[PDB]
């Protein structure tokens, strides 16, 4: 397997799947570095975020567990096609980039917080992360370039 990826076993179904411990992505199919990458993200802040405030809420009070539940729900809606990433980012991201559909632009290594950077550079073009934790909160990352 590529680095970052491991085989895993579904607990409910017994079917093999693949999990990436850098991006927290999981998928059924077997998976198959850039100077810069371009990503969008959807951030859900919690009461332990470095700045527990956002354009959505002056005082963010949800627990980290509650933030993760929200992230997990958004991931479900994106993967089912019931909702688009860009739509959910514009509506519900606690980052100011919500107004740009979550787009952060292009960036190099050494600019972003490290778990976010590592996830971004491990994603393939077009691929989306699982929940990624930083001091800002919990992110869904979409690599666009
Ligand atoms: C700075 C220009 N406004 S923005 O909303 O596109 C934005 C906000 C935060 C970012 F980290 C990146 C882009």
The CATH code of the domain that includes 41 is: 3.10.50.40
Method used experimentally: X-ray
60-to-10, 39, 134 alpha-carbon distances in Å? 35, 25, 16
d(C-alpha 45, C-alpha 105), whole Å: 21
Residue 72 sits in the same domain as residue 135: yes
96-to-30, 58, 61, 92 alpha-carbon distances in Å? 35, 13, 18, 11
Where in the sequence is the domain holding 16, given as residue range(s)? 1-31
d(C-alpha 17, C-alpha 38), whole Å: 27
The answer, yes or no, to whether any atom of ligand 1 lies below 6 A from the CB of 71, is: no
Residue 18 sits in the same domain as residue 66: no
Residue 27 sits in the same domain as residue 42: no
Residue 26 sits in the same domain as residue 47: no
**Which atom of ligand 1 is the closest one to the Cα of 104?**
12
CB-CB contact of 16 with 8 (8 Å): yes
SS3 state at 21: coil
Longest dimension (CA), the chain: 45
Q: Which of 50, 54, 96 to mutate to test the pocket of ligand 1 (most atoms within 8 A of CB)?
A: 96
Residue 18 sits in the same domain as residue 63: no
- Give bridge partners of residue 142 from the DSSP assignment: 40, 128
Number of structural domains found in the chain: 2
Q: Tokens 């809606």 identify what position? A: 77
Residue 11 sits in the same domain as residue 45: no
d(C-alpha 34, C-alpha 37), whole Å: 7
CB-CB contact of 85 with 91 (8 Å): no
- Strand pairing class (103-107; 5-9): unpaired
Through-space distance between the first and last CA atoms of the chain, rounded to whole angstroms: 23
Burial 49-74 (b: 16+ CB within 10 A, else e): beebebeeeeebebebeebbebbeeb
Instruction: Give a three-class secondary structure readout of 63-129.
Output: CHHHHHHHHHHHHHHHHHCCCCHHHHHHHHCCCHHHHHCCEEEEECCCCCCHHHHHHHHHCCCCCEC
Residue 109 sits in the same domain as residue 138: yes
The answer, yes or no, to whether any atom of ligand 1 lies below 6 A from the CB of 100, is: yes
The CATH code of the domain that includes 1 is: 2.20.70.10
């Amino acid at each position: 397997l590529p680095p970052g990826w491991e085989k895993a076993m579904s607990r409910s179904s017994g079917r093999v799947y693949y999990f990436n411990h850098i991006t927290n992505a999981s998928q059924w199919e077997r998976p198959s570095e850039p100077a810069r990458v371009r990503c969008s993200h959807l951030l859900v802040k919690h009461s332990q975020s470095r700045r527990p405030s956002s354009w959505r809420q002056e005082k963010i009070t949800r627990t980290k567990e509650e933030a993760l539940e929200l992230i997990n729900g958004y991931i479900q809606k994106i993967k089912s096609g019931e909702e688009d990433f860009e739509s959910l980012a514009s509506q519900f991201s606690d980052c100011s980039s919500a107004k740009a559909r979550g787009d952060l632009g292009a960036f190099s290594r050494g600019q972003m917080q490290k778990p976010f950077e590592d996830a971004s550079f491990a994603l393939r073009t077009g691929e989306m992360s699982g929940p990624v934790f930083t001091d800002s909160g919990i992110h869904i990352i979409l690599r666009t370039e």
